[PDB]
Amino acid sequence: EKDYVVIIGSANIDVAGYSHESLNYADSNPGKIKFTPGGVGRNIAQNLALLGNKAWLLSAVGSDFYGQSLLTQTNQSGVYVDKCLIVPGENTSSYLSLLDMLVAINDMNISNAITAEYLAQHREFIQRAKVIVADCNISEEALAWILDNAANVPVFVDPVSAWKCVKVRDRLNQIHTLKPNRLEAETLSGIALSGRDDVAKVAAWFHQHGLNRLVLSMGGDGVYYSDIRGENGWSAPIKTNVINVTGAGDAMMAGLASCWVDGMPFAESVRFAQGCSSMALSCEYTNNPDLSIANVISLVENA
Amino acid sequence: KDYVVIIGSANIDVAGYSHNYADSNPGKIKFTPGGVGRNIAQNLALGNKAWLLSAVGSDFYGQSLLTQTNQSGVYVDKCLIVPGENTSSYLSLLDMLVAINDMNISNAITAEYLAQHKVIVADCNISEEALAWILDNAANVPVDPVSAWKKPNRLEAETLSGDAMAGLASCWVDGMPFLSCEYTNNPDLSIANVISLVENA
Amino acid sequence: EKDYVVIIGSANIDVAGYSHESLNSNPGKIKFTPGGVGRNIAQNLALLGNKAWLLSAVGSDFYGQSLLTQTNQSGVYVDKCLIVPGENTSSYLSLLMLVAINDMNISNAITAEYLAQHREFIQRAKVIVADCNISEEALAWILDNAANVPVFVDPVSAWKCVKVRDRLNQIHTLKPNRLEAETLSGIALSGRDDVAKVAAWFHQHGLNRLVLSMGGDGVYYSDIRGENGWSAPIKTNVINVTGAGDAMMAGLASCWVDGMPFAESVRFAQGCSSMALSCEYTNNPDLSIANVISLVENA
Amino acid sequence: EKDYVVIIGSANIDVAGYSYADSNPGKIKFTPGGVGRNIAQNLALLGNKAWLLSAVGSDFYGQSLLTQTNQSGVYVDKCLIVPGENTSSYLSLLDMLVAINDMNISNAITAEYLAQHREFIQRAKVIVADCNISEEALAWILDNAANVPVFVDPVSAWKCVKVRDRLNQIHTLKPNRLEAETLSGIALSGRDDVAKVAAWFHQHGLNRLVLSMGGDGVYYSDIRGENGWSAPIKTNVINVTGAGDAMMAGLASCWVDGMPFAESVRFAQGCSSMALSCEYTNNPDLSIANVISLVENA
Amino acid sequence: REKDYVVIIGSANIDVAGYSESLNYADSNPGKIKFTPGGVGRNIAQNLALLGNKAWLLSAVGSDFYGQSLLTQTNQSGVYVDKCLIVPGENTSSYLSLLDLVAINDMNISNAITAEYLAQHREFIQRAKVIVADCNISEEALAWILDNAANVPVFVDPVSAWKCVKVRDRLNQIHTLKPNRLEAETLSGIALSGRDDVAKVAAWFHQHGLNRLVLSMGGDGVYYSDIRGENGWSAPIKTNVINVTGAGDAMMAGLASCWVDGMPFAESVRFAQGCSSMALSCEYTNNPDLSIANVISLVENA
Amino acid sequence: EKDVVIIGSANIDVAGYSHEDSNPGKIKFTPGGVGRNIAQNLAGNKAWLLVGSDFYGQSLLTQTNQSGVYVDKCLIVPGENTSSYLSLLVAINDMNISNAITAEYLAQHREFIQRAKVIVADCNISEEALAWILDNAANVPVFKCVKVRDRLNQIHTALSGRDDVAKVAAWFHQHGLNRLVLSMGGDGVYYSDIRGENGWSAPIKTNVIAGDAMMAGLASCWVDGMPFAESVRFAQGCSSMALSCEYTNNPDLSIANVISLV
Amino acid sequence: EKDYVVIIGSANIDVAGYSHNYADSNPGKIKFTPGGVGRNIAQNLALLGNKAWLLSAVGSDFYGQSLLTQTNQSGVYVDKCLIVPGENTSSYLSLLDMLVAINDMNISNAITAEYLAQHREFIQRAKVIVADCNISEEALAWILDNAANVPVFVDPVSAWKCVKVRDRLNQIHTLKPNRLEAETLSGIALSGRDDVAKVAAWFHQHGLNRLVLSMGGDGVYYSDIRGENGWSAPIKTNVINVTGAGDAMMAGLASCWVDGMPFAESVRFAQGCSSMALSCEYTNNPDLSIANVISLVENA
Numbered sequence A: 001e002k003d004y005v006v007i008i009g010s011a012n013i014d015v016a017g018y019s020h021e022s023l024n025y026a027d028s029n030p031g032k033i034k035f036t037p038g039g040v041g042r043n044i045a046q047n048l049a050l051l052g053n054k055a056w057l058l059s060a061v062g063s064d065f066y067g068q069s070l071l072t073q074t075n076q077s078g079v080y081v082d083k084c085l086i087v088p089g090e091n092t093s094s095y096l097s098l099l100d101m102l103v104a105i106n107d108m109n110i111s112n113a114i115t116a117e118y119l120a121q122h123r124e125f126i127q128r129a130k131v132i133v134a135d136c137n138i139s140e141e142a143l144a145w146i147l148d149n150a151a152n153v154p155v156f157v158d159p160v161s162a163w164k165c166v167k168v169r170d171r172l173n174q175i176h177t178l179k180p181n182r183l184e185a186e187t188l189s190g191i192a193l194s195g196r197d198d199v200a201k202v203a204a205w206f207h208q209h210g211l212n213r214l215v216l217s218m219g220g221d222g223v224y225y226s227d228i229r230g231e232n233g234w235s236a237p238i239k240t241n242v243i244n245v246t247g248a249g250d251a252m253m254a255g256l257a258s259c260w261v262d263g264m265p266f267a268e269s270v271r272f273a274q275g276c277s278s279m280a281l282s283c284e285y286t287n288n289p290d291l292s293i294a295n296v297i298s299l300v301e302n303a
Numbered sequence B: 001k002d003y004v005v006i007i008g009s010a011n012i013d014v015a016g017y018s019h020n021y022a023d024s025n026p027g028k029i030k031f032t033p034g035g036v037g038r039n040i041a042q043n044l045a046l047g048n049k050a051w052l053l054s055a056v057g058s059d060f061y062g063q064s065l066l067t068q069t070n071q072s073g074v075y076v077d078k079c080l081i082v083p084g085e086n087t088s089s090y091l092s093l094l095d096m097l098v099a100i101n102d103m104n105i106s107n108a109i110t111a112e113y114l115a116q117h118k119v120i121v122a123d124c125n126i127s128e129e130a131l132a133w134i135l136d137n138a139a140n141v142p143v144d145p146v147s148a149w150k151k152p153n154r155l156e157a158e159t160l161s162g163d164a165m166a167g168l169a170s171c172w173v174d175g176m177p178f179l180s181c182e183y184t185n186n187p188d189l190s191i192a193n194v195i196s197l198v199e200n201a
Numbered sequence C: 001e002k003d004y005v006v007i008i009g010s011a012n013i014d015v016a017g018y019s020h021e022s023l024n025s026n027p028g029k030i031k032f033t034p035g036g037v038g039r040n041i042a043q044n045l046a047l048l049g050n051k052a053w054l055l056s057a058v059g060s061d062f063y064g065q066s067l068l069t070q071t072n073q074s075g076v077y078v079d080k081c082l083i084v085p086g087e088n089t090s091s092y093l094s095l096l097m098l099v100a101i102n103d104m105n106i107s108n109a110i111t112a113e114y115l116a117q118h119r120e121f122i123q124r125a126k127v128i129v130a131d132c133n134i135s136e137e138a139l140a141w142i143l144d145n146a147a148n149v150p151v152f153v154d155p156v157s158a159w160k161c162v163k164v165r166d167r168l169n170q171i172h173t174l175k176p177n178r179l180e181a182e183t184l185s186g187i188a189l190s191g192r193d194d195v196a197k198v199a200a201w202f203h204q205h206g207l208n209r210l211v212l213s214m215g216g217d218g219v220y221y222s223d224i225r226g227e228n229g230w231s232a233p234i235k236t237n238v239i240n241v242t243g244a245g246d247a248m249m250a251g252l253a254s255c256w257v258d259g260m261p262f263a264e265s266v267r268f269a270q271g272c273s274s275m276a277l278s279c280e281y282t283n284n285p286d287l288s289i290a291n292v293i294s295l296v297e298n299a
Numbered sequence D: 001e002k003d004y005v006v007i008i009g010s011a012n013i014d015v016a017g018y019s020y021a022d023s024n025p026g027k028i029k030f031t032p033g034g035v036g037r038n039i040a041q042n043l044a045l046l047g048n049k050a051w052l053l054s055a056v057g058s059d060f061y062g063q064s065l066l067t068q069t070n071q072s073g074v075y076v077d078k079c080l081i082v083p084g085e086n087t088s089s090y091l092s093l094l095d096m097l098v099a100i101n102d103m104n105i106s107n108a109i110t111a112e113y114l115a116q117h118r119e120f121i122q123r124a125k126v127i128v129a130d131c132n133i134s135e136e137a138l139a140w141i142l143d144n145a146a147n148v149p150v151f152v153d154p155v156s157a158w159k160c161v162k163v164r165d166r167l168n169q170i171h172t173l174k175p176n177r178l179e180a181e182t183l184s185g186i187a188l189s190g191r192d193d194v195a196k197v198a199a200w201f202h203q204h205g206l207n208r209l210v211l212s213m214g215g216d217g218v219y220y221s222d223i224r225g226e227n228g229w230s231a232p233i234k235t236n237v238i239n240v241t242g243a244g245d246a247m248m249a250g251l252a253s254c255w256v257d258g259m260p261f262a263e264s265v266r267f268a269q270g271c272s273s274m275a276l277s278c279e280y281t282n283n284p285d286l287s288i289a290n291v292i293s294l295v296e297n298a
Numbered sequence E: 001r002e003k004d005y006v007v008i009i010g011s012a013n014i015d016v017a018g019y020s021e022s023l024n025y026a027d028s029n030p031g032k033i034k035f036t037p038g039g040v041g042r043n044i045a046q047n048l049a050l051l052g053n054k055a056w057l058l059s060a061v062g063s064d065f066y067g068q069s070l071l072t073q074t075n076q077s078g079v080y081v082d083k084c085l086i087v088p089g090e091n092t093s094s095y096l097s098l099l100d101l102v103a104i105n106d107m108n109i110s111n112a113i114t115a116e117y118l119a120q121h122r123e124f125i126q127r128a129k130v131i132v133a134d135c136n137i138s139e140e141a142l143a144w145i146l147d148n149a150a151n152v153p154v155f156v157d158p159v160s161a162w163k164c165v166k167v168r169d170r171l172n173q174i175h176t177l178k179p180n181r182l183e184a185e186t187l188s189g190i191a192l193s194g195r196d197d198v199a200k201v202a203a204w205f206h207q208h209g210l211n212r213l214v215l216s217m218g219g220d221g222v223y224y225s226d227i228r229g230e231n232g233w234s235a236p237i238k239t240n241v242i243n244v245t246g247a248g249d250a251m252m253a254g255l256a257s258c259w260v261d262g263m264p265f266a267e268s269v270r271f272a273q274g275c276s277s278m279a280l281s282c283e284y285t286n287n288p289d290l291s292i293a294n295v296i297s298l299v300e301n302a
Numbered sequence F: 001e002k003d004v005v006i007i008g009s010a011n012i013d014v015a016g017y018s019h020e021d022s023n024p025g026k027i028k029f030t031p032g033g034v035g036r037n038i039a040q041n042l043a044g045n046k047a048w049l050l051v052g053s054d055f056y057g058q059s060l061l062t063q064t065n066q067s068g069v070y071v072d073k074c075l076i077v078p079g080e081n082t083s084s085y086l087s088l089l090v091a092i093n094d095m096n097i098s099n100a101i102t103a104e105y106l107a108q109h110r111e112f113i114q115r116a117k118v119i120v121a122d123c124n125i126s127e128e129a130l131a132w133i134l135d136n137a138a139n140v141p142v143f144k145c146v147k148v149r150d151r152l153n154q155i156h157t158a159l160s161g162r163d164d165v166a167k168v169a170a171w172f173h174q175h176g177l178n179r180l181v182l183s184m185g186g187d188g189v190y191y192s193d194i195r196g197e198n199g200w201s202a203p204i205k206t207n208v209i210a211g212d213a214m215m216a217g218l219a220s221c222w223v224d225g226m227p228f229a230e231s232v233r234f235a236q237g238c239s240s241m242a243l244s245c246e247y248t249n250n251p252d253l254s255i256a257n258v259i260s261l262v
Numbered sequence G: 001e002k003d004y005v006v007i008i009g010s011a012n013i014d015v016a017g018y019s020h021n022y023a024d025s026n027p028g029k030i031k032f033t034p035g036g037v038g039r040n041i042a043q044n045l046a047l048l049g050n051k052a053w054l055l056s057a058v059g060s061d062f063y064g065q066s067l068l069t070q071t072n073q074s075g076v077y078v079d080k081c082l083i084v085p086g087e088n089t090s091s092y093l094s095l096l097d098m099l100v101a102i103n104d105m106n107i108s109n110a111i112t113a114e115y116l117a118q119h120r121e122f123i124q125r126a127k128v129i130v131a132d133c134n135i136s137e138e139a140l141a142w143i144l145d146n147a148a149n150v151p152v153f154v155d156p157v158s159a160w161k162c163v164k165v166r167d168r169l170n171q172i173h174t175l176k177p178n179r180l181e182a183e184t185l186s187g188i189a190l191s192g193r194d195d196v197a198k199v200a201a202w203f204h205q206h207g208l209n210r211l212v213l214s215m216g217g218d219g220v221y222y223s224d225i226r227g228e229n230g231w232s233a234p235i236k237t238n239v240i241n242v243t244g245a246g247d248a249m250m251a252g253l254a255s256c257w258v259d260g261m262p263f264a265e266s267v268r269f270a271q272g273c274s275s276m277a278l279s280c281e282y283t284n285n286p287d288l289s290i291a292n293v294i295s296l297v298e299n300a
């Protein structure tokens, strides 16, 4: 109610291929192919809407049925998408994935339709939000715009990929919270993360470059959280049986931002976000439709 | 050199012919592309070179609308595909009798959209300041009223005291000194036939 | 559960128009919603926790695909529906009160042969709900090949309900209104006094159960075995009259499958109708047995 | 958009004497005072809904303070009225020679009192607190801020050290030479020693440091790396009282307006200059437009 | 050539290679295990020495016998390693490879190559003809080299995608970068899915100050681009790959050797491609028969 | 002053640790080989181990000798290179110098082997060499080679269920195996004797972070005149101590520490 | 509510050339700005919220009608201006970097006693009269002799054009000269800032009521014949273009007189107007207002 979250990210059409028993590179093996809504920013937005947050998605889609399906379904998930960009002439971004996991391919060129001018057309709206969530799928110039014209509003940035997260390197002094993985953080810092011993030096590198809060996900080991103010620590993983690994980081980011707007401490926010990730893990769907604050709180309580 | 632009609306027309009132009166129901501006454009494709500046929703209705309108010759690249709203609709009881309109996406056709870019054609569905905005930016380069709430008729004129009428305006690009069809507009209408009217009587 | 309900009805695209005050272009709201008597009854049946299978016809157009997708999303199995390439999805235009138009020709695509392809399945159901939107031959087939399974028939309209006249001896529960029953019987219903004579006419022609809706007056129920009576209307705030009879029919059938007495089935069906009225949408998604039970509870 | 600013500070009665041997006749002035109260008034003058959470002593003086402050556009309905104590006071012998401060009612601002207005504090845009209150109260505010920025005014060198272990919970701190020296323990005897003092503050978790070094200017520093110097706006002094309060008000008002650090420091310096240019503790002509005007002429 | 030299600041690893009908996995799996000299910088040094260049290696090794063995082996290959650092307490860098799967690198002694250590050999570095650096060293060391190059061209090998970002804001001090698809995608942030977006990637690099870009693409070729406007494609020299290791090192060696010999950009790229081709045809990381004459033979015979 | 012979392999162990292109991690160069490890672990025992001209071999041998192992009778052959063992935790093994141990090499120290208390043998040597040891053991206890068939009768010391382990163990005893110490993990260490005392032993609680130290324990307790069960307790403690350390052989592994663990 | 100000002055077309000159085909900046002392003062007064009427002379050139139009759009009533057919509107060429000066102003002599006599009724009913020294001795004589007790503020414009006011100081309410003009008139030397006070005494002895001398090395000296004398402190400003300053000063003084403001403070306000004039590259600062000038003098 007058408090909202703006997400500038990508909205993709996800094509997922599953094969019966084990799948090997040779021969055509029958299985299940799914067309599901996707895109880091879109997923984060949907999960935020599911967490009882007024989420506004600022993405770019095409004039094809894929785009309209994305927009309609996303709006139907409680996400305000009236300010989204529909580009007439270009194609909706796509993501092909062989899950279980083999190589993932992404055809995302409409993400560059999200421009400085487009965001500038929605200035003040972005500047009057509680939190701004951006992903590294957009253009470097757009990220620059958001970070420079945030107007003292915290910007939470999702790295998405290791080759796409360098765009915020020279700009870490403008990011409120980065959640990279091992490969991503190794890529950014240049320091090897070959252990649980080597995360202090990476965190130190990030803080020396101006990063306020770092949420480094180190698989098995857990999630290492660090604040530039001196607050460092480790968080243990919440025991869960996997079904689909897709959507973990998105649920984490949604949780983190929702917990920031809820006036929650860093560590507690890390546990809660880990709970959202855990709920994402337990679902076959990219986005758990039953994802709620109550369920996540129950999960962190009972574990 | 000469380009024609119609800043009008594009609706989805649902027509009905009923011919108790409570008991389901049998008849015919047709789903056809509508909208004043879009119709004008379709009849400006009388061979004119037209461009449509209308707003449609991001639904199957809007996309089918722009598809049909595109195949009709008109260029639908400058049209605004609006997110968060529905395609304009028009309920016509024909045989005229009663007419209802669900047109709120006309708010997307605002002065900001009109800014970024022979005869300018517009309707009264357009918001106040937008209409007035193209009334300020006419630049001496040369409307078609719909109803009282929204060329004209005495009905709507005397309250303050355009489709088929609207394609004829092409005569101002011709230097000329001053109906019964199932398909909403004729699929192969040419000016030579309108002249053939005179050739007969 | 190997217990299911088969519904042979129509699936229309309903276009509803609401305005301010008609001056004869009156501004307002035009809504495109899924419709059709059989389809609606099917959805309501699925909402009452009955495994409902719809046997209808759609027109291979986006209208049809939308109808099927939404209806399936309402929990209704639509895999046995007919998708006809050449015809158009049936349509229903309403100026809501004033003027109702129906364009339903694909309803004749629901044929005896088509149903014969789904015989046994139809014959192995608990109840069959059919509407008078289909052809006389199709209704004749269903009634002749019911295999001792009760067939609940919705008259839908007065002009298309006469086809069940000479076939009333094969009908379990018939649910007509004033005009429909007047047309069928030929006896005037001008009052609460002439309903005994109409019930007598219907039963003399072989109708097992008659559920005559007389609006204000209430709902008069009658059995050929002798159990007759009136049911008082549950007074409710009007919002949308569409879907009332559909929800009532759904209630009657759902209550038959639950081994419920005639009168109680009528009361429950009346509750379903009341829930239908309290919603602007044709089908209330929150329609449940518990809620209806609550509604009868305050009455 | 429901945007407001909450100030937890002190409200004092300022008594100034104008004229150390003989009985000296002169003029005695009774003016509203207190760091937090002044900041609140200046914020109200800068077009911000400011809510003051202070304590008064049921005295006619206190009621007068509340009325005057309300007339300055500041909401004082949530202030604490303590029955038994006296409104805090500040006495000055100007000719400045003797300065005395009697503020014990500042301890009436407690953790429980603030906890009664928690959610309200947690739904504010900015929190401005002063070091006149108890360490426990400051601890409450800083611990229950709910990710809402807390701007802390050091007030005095002996009263600022209570935030020295809570610097990691403070957004913007605005100390002078003696205050920052006392806190850090590092001498500011140079213009080079601001790098090491700022570094000390940053090692302890401070986000933003706004060190005012009189003549020299204002050195600003962010823990993310943005450091720099701002030249002082040279002005003809008249009364030095109220400068830092207007500066703090300027900084917070610029935070709620989405303004960069350095630019906010200049704006705050302009507010300070307007305060200096006034005989009054609080300049009644203090506005965004006027401050913008002197900042243009620079 | 005489009293003309090249300084290489790189890594020196001990490479442990495991060779496999199939892989038995657990419960042992017979095969062949080879210990060969390695490390990008070291390899570049050897290849440069083979191309008739006076090469000085500025690396760091561990007081383990491996380090002295490395230094001796490199010295016998004609490489001056007298200025290398021998670190007592640390272990010689290592690279484990399961050839065909698994690749592991244990290189922390690469951080012993520091700004101070190089500062001790400044003047010498500043009197070289060319400086070859790799991205295995510390960011501070790279910063030092780039800041104290004294107008001597710095050729930088990215080595890895996660280790090349250390030069991303320091590209304005680099004379020549030799990245692959993934490395250039990582640095630029621009997708290399096409051959049209290599113009866009090159444009990105040039906007950030890179003088010369030599983008090595597996297939399709090597795209070369100059900030001065000279862009073009070079076709790959078809060869039967025996072992792919050591290609880029020979490429870099070729590029630098061709710079000091006053050769045009394009021809230098072709020559370097010839060095890569000779590297591919050998089982060893470094071809001992690598010469200017042989490369010339390979490129002449297209 | 006059009281063990270990005939085993001596490998160069290269260990690769990597987290779950180019992935950074830890590569350790440690002395290795089953026989070498057992020998080192045995050494409060007087241990004799029965390599190439490479530096690797001399470093390995000196390391073992400084670890208290007498290696003067080990074979240093200047014709081949020291054996190697690669482990990425996949295991690759380059062991051909272990085949240099031939009948003449073993026969040259026959008297010495036959005057020992225990003989420790490995399943990596040739069938003919193992045959030599088992046939020329001279009533001295001899402690994955499937060729061991029909040769079980000369060695001192399917499984889907735990009831059917009786059939496999009984099978081993039926083929002439005297004592069986089967390591399964979960259950622990199952011991079985042809004389009838059979049983299961639970694992000594440790975090994995082994078998060579186990064998070393068994033999060391045999020479210490200790019953089978207690020997199993000690050997399991040795296994546990091996597990709690990153390096191949725990330098703090002692009888004093292991008895403490039990 | 019919109180207005009448300005009898010159209207020039100012062409300014900047180019930091011995050769040919040398690129630079050429600016076309409306000018003329009287016209500029009038415009500045109109910007200060004064009803200003210009009584000037323009030529049959369309440029002149355009001039009048631009000035009218600046809020100055120019309907009483003289349009002489057959001749051209006066022009002023200036080559700055001031370096070179050329002036074509002879239509300024078309401003005659008779022309003013047709607008006598109107001129005598103004609050203040602003005249420039671009006009004829006969016209100036007319204005000063037929002022009918209405204050006449006269700008000297030039040193050679400042001689017409000498023996006629007894008819002037306020003169705003520079160093050379005042020296030429007085006969008292200019050197230094201290032994120059007697110049004001000379002016007052000849009957001058108010004197506003602009001096360098900080200081604008104001003097009244009643004894009211003083110096004014300079407003530190960034000199973008010095053109149009004195016009803004005179405009300020007159506007402050009609608004009932004291002498010294009127001089300060005028200094603020000059400061606003200096901050503009254009001859006339378009944002010149009472509020902005008050802000600038306040912050000083």
Ligand SMILES: O=c1[nH]cc([C@@H]2O[C@H](CO)[C@@H](O)[C@H]2O)c(=O)[nH]1
Pocket (backbone or CB within 6 Å): A010, A012, A014, A037, A038, A039, A040, A041, A043, A095, A106, A137, A160, A161, A246, A247, A248, A250, A286
């Ligand atoms: O490079 C990208 N890969 C994948 C995604 C999307 O994010 C989802 C991961 O949760 C994924 O399913 C894909 O849709 C993306 O946005 N960019």
Ligand SMILES: O=c1[nH]cc([C@@H]2O[C@H](CO)[C@@H](O)[C@H]2O)c(=O)[nH]1
Pocket (backbone or CB within 6 Å): B024, C010, C012, C014, C034, C035, C036, C037, C038, C040, C092, C102, C133, C156, C157, C242, C243, C244, C245, C246, C282
């Ligand atoms: O003739 C008909 N009229 C209306 C309907 C449908 O019945 C519904 C009213 O409850 C409505 O959905 C309409 O579509 C029909 O099936 N046949």
Ligand SMILES: O=c1[nH]cc([C@@H]2O[C@H](CO)[C@@H](O)[C@H]2O)c(=O)[nH]1
Pocket (backbone or CB within 6 Å): D010, D012, D014, D032, D033, D034, D035, D036, D038, D090, D101, D132, D155, D156, D241, D242, D243, D244, D245, D281
């Ligand atoms: O110790 C203190 N002395 C003075 C003040 C107040 O600050 C004002 C000066 O800015 C002043 O009004 C005084 O009351 C205070 O809060 N604490």
Ligand SMILES: O=c1[nH]cc([C@@H]2O[C@H](CO)[C@@H](O)[C@H]2O)c(=O)[nH]1
Pocket (backbone or CB within 6 Å): E011, E013, E015, E037, E038, E039, E040, E041, E043, E095, E105, E107, E136, E159, E160, E245, E246, E247, E248, E249, E285, F022
């Ligand atoms: O991270 C690294 N991996 C591999 C190498 C070496 O580069 C050689 C391949 O060109 C190779 O021999 C390896 O040792 C390195 O230096 N750093």
